[PDB]
Amino acid sequence: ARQVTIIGAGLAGTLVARLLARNGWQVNLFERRPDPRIETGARGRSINLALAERGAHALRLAGLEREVLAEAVMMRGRMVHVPGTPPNLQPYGRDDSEVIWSINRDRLNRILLDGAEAAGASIHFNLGLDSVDFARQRLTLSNVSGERLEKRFHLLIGADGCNSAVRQAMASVVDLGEHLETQPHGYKELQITPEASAQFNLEPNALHIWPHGDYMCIALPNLDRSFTVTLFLHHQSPAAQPASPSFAQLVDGHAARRFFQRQFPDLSPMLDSLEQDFEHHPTGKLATLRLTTWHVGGQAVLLGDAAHPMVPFHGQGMNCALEDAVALAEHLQSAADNASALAAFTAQRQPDALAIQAMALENYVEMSPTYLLERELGQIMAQRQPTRFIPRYSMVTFSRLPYAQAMARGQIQEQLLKFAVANHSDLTSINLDAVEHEVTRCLPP
Ligand SMILES: Cc1cc2nc3c(=O)[nH]c(=O)nc-3n(C[C@H](O)[C@H](O)[C@H](O)COP(=O)(O)OP(=O)(O)OC[C@H]3O[C@@H](n4cnc5c(N)ncnc54)[C@H](O)[C@@H]3O)c2cc1C
């Protein structure tokens, strides 16, 4: 039985643990945090995530999709809130097959941990990786007190998130060629209670967005009709725009309330605990990190956020990490040796990681005239050639097309629409048959 040590019992690490353990690998998984399945008197955790077809399919292959979806809220469309216009519900597709799922992160992690243990993995909590000695094949772990314990390893999977210690250890024995692109937005998680969301008729089966240019809020539903709201706002006001809002201007929760009342007036009344959430929840940081290599020989590999931190604006980070886990287990299972597997994994996944990293950054702008007309012509082309003209968002979210192919086809589509609408003011002026022939010329089924 082949041996593997996984660092991080998050989303990627627990899935890859299950996939390898059920294929007969001897799997030990090490997690810095306590076991979330051991109920304590601590406050619950209400962060949720959008699960799309890529993540769902990964869970399906692992036999866990049914259990996860039973605890998830269907989101049938995007609900865009702008003051002065009623909320506009933009359906994701023609029917409920094209939806995304709002799942509580803690509940998803618990289901995955059970799945990993059911397949035979051993999971060891309260042990955080501190360092790796690659030449001696040993690693050093410790609890929160820092009491150190050493373990031998044969294959090390770094599934330990965007601040990966495995990545830090690798960067010392190989040049990972890291390129860090900091994101100026921080984020803050806020809460809408079930009573408030019902009082204001907030639609439960939708993803909600309050755009406001350089900042915005999103809200995702929970099973009990509460919503988790996330504010995205610059950490600092730019020099050469020092008045603009930023976390630095919001000195306390009362300042945050004044900010919401002015900039997000239909949302502020739903946020009963704004002042306390704002002061008690930490401001998060965002970034894009691109690595030239993801592995050290056959000894260690990164996946998930450890390999490709991305901005969250496409809701694909977890979905990508679960897709990584499937791919890594597949390569390891069937390769000639571990070094071959890890090289092949990296070669397969790196172009797609770059693509979603880029599309996630682009997606922020797109959710921040000419646009209507292009989107209108695109809807017609999707009706005439539904196997050829598929909106990029739909390729990313509702299909398993490799992200880089989705991005390439999306650019062909966006250029074709922009050129077709240029020098036209309405659609009856446009030759739909000529556009369709360009679709069938440039977009294979
Ligand atoms: C605000 C926000 C919103 C998001 N929304 C979405 C969304 O809607 N949909 C989506 O698909 N993605 C979303 N994402 C992205 C998603 O959260 C991540 O991409 C995903 O959790 C990555 O999974 P992972 O298993 O690689 O890492 P994680 O889920 O972070 O798990 C890493 C694990 O490693 C552990 N760990 C860390 N360091 C060590 C160490 N030294 N030793 C041992 N254990 C360690 C951690 O405790 C954790 O258990 C969002 C991200 C943010 C910030």
Ligand SMILES: O=C(O)c1ccc(-c2cccc(Cl)c2Cl)o1
């Ligand atoms: O229509 C969508 O799928 C949509 C709009 C906004 C998002 C999103 C999802 C997860 C995390 C974050 Cl930050 C965002 Cl902005 O998803």
Ligand SMILES: [Ca+2]
């Ligand atoms: Ca420790």
